[PDB]
Design a protein around this ligand. Structure first.
Ligand code: HEC
Ligand code: HEC
Ligand SMILES: [Zn+2]
Ligand SMILES: [Zn+2]
Ligand SMILES: [Zn+2]
Ligand SMILES: [Zn+2]
Ligand SMILES: [Zn+2]
Lengths: 106, 106
């Protein structure tokens, strides 16, 4: 999928987690976010003029998704333990990772 | 100053901005935050075992302070224009930069 689709997958599933009732719903949404993050990691920021994979800012761009995936994995551990409220709170901590990349690249 | 002092300078002055009344108070606090950020940029994260300046994660650590300084400079432009409420809102956007580095390194 393209970057827009991957970001809206992240966006919609974060909301699903917030409104979820049980561990299975949270797990399903986090699983979809993880795949969307790794897919988006292959894209480039539109406003970044230098697209070279070896450039510092492309390393930083991909690094940001590795951090996001790590946080998603933290939340998945809680969801797999059945800790719904805890997993929802962990998903809340994602938001500053989203907002940070956005401010930096958009 | 050491890392602890620099972080509490950032911490206390962010609160000063939130409670400020005029552009001069906001400007003074942002100016102190900027210096504290550049000083902290010379430190290393305690829990990072590899301290080599050329390592990717030390590049990332220093990069995070350059981003923070850029955001402080955005807020300073508004404060120097007398736009108090706008500068306070810009200081609010700093928080995800703080929280992101913290989650990543602490
Ligand atoms: C964390 C969970 C999130 C969430 C919820 C979103 N993102 Fe991102 N994002 C990144 C870039 C470069 C863009 C610009 C895309 C473009 O200009 O084409 C975006 C954009 C978005 C949107 C807006 C989509 C739109 O309609 O324009 C949304 C809703 C969104 N994102 C959600 C880059 C990154 C990251 C790189 C390291 C990370 C992490 C995130 N985004 C994280 C998130
Ligand atoms: C943005 C405006 C902020 C604010 C308000 C704070 N920081 Fe940081 N910070 C960083 C690291 C590596 C640490 C660990 C320090 C240690 O373990 O010795 C901290 C710690 C803090 C604290 C806690 C101080 C304490 O009493 O333990 C506080 C209050 C704090 N910070 C405020 C690293 C970074 C960054 C690197 C890129 C950035 C940016 C920030 N911090 C940003 C902020
Ligand atoms: Zn969209
Ligand atoms: Zn960068
Ligand atoms: Zn302290
Ligand atoms: Zn890093
Ligand atoms: Zn970063």
């Amino acid at each position: 999928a393209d970057l827009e689709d991957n970001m809206e997958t992240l966006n919609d599933n974060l909301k699903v987690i917030e409104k979820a009732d049980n561990a299975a719903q949270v797990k399903d949404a986090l699983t979809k976010m993880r795949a969307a993050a790794l897919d988006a990691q292959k894209a480039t920021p539109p406003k970044l003029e230098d697209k070279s994979p070896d450039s510092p800012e492309m390393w930083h761009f991909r690094h940001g998704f590795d951090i996001l995936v790590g946080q998603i994995d933290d939340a998945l551990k809680l969801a797999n333990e059945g800790k719904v409220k805890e997993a929802q709170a962990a998903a809340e901590q994602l938001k500053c990772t989203c907002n940070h990349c956005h401010q930096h690249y958009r």
